[PDB]
Amino acid sequence: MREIVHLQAGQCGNQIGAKFWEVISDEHGIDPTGTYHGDSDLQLERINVYYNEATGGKYVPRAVLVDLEPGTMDSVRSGPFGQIFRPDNFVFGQSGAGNNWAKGHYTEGAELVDSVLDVVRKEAESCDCLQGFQLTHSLGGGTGSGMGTLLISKIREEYPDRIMNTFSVVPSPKVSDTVVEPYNATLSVHQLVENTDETYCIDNEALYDICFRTLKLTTPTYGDLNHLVSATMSGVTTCLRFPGQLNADLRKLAVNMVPFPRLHFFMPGFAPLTSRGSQQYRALTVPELTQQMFDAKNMMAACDPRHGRYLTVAAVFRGRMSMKEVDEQMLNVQNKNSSYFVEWIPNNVKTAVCDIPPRGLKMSATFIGNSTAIQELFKRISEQFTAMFRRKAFLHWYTGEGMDEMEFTEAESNMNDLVSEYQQYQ
């Protein structure tokens, strides 16, 4: 009875959601046609959090699908798990954003947001007690960054007493997939700072590095790349669906994770990451699990925490384990690494446990971290922005729409204030 509503805009958000619903449907024993075929009654017990019940035992997800072009939902619908989605919840535009923040925010976004708000108002008022909203988009894209932020702004004005959480894909440090990526990311995260409550930043290069060294996978694809995002995706709302020794919903994490409202930029992680050829030889226990957690190369963002200090750290455990060893090892990992945590907060680690491990793993867990080392991730974006903006590189696709230069300046100013606020607490 703490329902959640899933939003996805852009091809990145759609293809991340297409694997998240894979993971959730596998967890709850749901068929591709939309029928339940699991074994236990626990997987049906809080099925209302992610699914909406219909007659005859048919279960429909509470997802809203949108972009500006009909390119990716044709593959999303025609996939293996495309029949579960409601045909009414497919809304779409005509002209692609063309990797433009202006096209997704003022011209086409303004005339498409009304139907997306229609779908969200249809779905949100049917739930018994809405917990919050969940969105997946890409910071470097056109129809994701320009229009998901419009959706955040148009939703936050109507429910001011809920929790907003976004699922972003940060521009990579080395290789760019779009030349207007700083232009399309600075404005998007400028709008993201004042509106959301808890955000999760994902870098593609860190995922490639963790899939090449730890996973020993020389050739992963994008579909296998989205599986780790789905892993850290379903691991944060596991206590809302299953009982545990110590439950923690999304609001409890939001309270324990955000000390000040403008510092809510978190780095997701996943604990039991092994190779295929080294599965027989792992011996999963809590020590090697928490030693694999706080390794700097287990992180899904491009920020190495050694240049910064952790502010607050979350650790949601799942499965059969005892309890002194969890407290003992969050004592230990905080004690010997006191240079990497803050000295003005006595306890930095929030722990939570559940009782039902995932389908086929003995135990599993998810890492969420608020570190002051994320200031370097915004620093390179600010440098690229102030290098492109100084010579007016690609601006005429924005002032050629009806924007202003001063909005670019205030977005860069907000970025500098955010970097200074993260640096000041060090």
């Binding site: 005509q94 050829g277 009782d355 086929g360 793993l361």
Partner: protein
């Protein structure tokens, strides 16, 4: 602006080309120590896979084996040490009521 239909001539919908093989041609000899898929992280094995149970089906937990292993507390049950309501205590109970 929104369509009713995403298919040709404003009728029905678009069925795209689906890639049969989304994986990668091993141009050289494919390695044995190569972790090609990534759905193996949590795969339930066929037929046999552990369901989700509760505390009474656990071990060393709350409510576990309470009616089964009741012979251990039987010697503390069959002693005549519990207070039996005699005439005067029952009289006080009736006196309040």
């Amino acid at each position: 602006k929104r369509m009713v239909f995403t298919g040709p001539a404003y009728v029905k919908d678009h069925l795209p080309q689906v890639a049969q093989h989304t994986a990668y041609i091993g141009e050289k000899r494919p390695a044995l120590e190569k972790t090609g898929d990534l759905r193996y992280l949590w795969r339930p094995a066929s037929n046999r896979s552990l369901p989700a149970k509760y505390k009474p089906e656990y071990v060393g937990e709350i409510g576990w084996g309470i009616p089964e292993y009741d012979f251990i507390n039987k010697t503390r049950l069959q002693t005549g040490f519990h207070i039996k309501y005699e005439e005067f205590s029952q009289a006080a109970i009736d006196k309040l009521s």
